Amino acid sequence: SMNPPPPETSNPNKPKRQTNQLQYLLRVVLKTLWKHQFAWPFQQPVDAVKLNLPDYYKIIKTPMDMGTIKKRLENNYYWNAQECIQDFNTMFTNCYIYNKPGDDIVLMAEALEKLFLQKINELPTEE
Ligand SMILES: CC[C@@H]1C(=O)N(C)c2cnc(Nc3ccc(C(=O)NC4CCN(C)CC4)cc3OC)nc2N1C1CCCC1
């Protein structure tokens, strides 16, 4: 309140490469998390105006969400799987910083994180 613009998702200046890890992150990791029962609050940027939380972007200076992550993968924005994994981690950490521990939103993030960590453990060897 006001809302910032959403995170950048494309840069045609950035070099691009398709790898088996980035593919997996899109087609497996993002897809499985997106479809989870608890995914819906994490599918787009926090609208702090709509939610009437004017402090949200006073506290969270590195917002991230799965809608942004989806687009960055589509746009070949990431050179490395680690860049993408960091964005997921940022999304979770933001939720943990902003919200009271144990609140339902935190439990929802925790569940998605547990699933994300399981999929990351199965990240294919770079080929
Ligand atoms: C930004 C803080 C935190 C967070 O970290 N994320 C990511 C977040 C992302 N998106 C949402 N979204 C919504 C949250 C609540 C509602 C909603 O309609 N709540 C009803 C209000 C009336 N009540 C009788 C029934 C419940 C709708 C939402 O989006 C349309 N909430 C989030 N929260 C929550 C904000 C309030 C709890 C914590």
Q: Which tokens sit at 113?
A: 């994180």
Is residue 40 within 8 Å of residue 66, measured between CB atoms? no
* Experimental method, per PDB record: X-ray
What own/partner pairs with CB < 8 Å and gap ≥ 24 does 26-32 have? Answer: 26/70, 26/73, 26/74, 28/119, 29/88, 29/116, 29/119, 29/120, 30/66, 30/69, 30/70, 30/73, 32/115, 32/119
Phi and psi torsions of 74, nearest 5°: -55, -35
Q: Which tokens sit at 109?
A: 């993030």
CA 20–ligand 1 middle distance (angstroms) = 35
Residues 6+ apart with CB under 8 A from 45: 3, 6, 7, 63, 65, 67, 68
Is residue 119 within 8 Å of residue 29, measured between CB atoms? yes
Is residue 75 within 8 Å of residue 103, measured between CB atoms? no
HSE toward the beta carbon, residue 102, CA cutoff 13 A: 0
> Looking at residue 2, what DSSP letter applies?
P
Give the residue carrying structure tokens 């926090």: 46
> Looking at residue 29, what DSSP letter applies?
I
Give the residue carrying structure tokens 């950048």: 8
> Looking at residue 44, what DSSP letter applies?
S
CA 15–ligand 1 middle distance (angstroms) = 37
Q: Quick one: how far is CA 85 from the chain centroid?
A: 8
> Looking at residue 40, what DSSP letter applies?
G
Resolution (A): 1.7
Give the residue carrying structure tokens 């070949």: 76
Q: Is 50 helix (H, G, I), strand (E, B) or coil?
A: coil
Q: Is the CB of 39 under 6 A from ligand 1?
A: no
Beta strands, E only, 33-82: none
Residue type, 91: M
Is residue 117 within 8 Å of residue 111, measured between CB atoms? no
CATH superfamily of 19-123: Bromodomain-like (1.20.920.10)
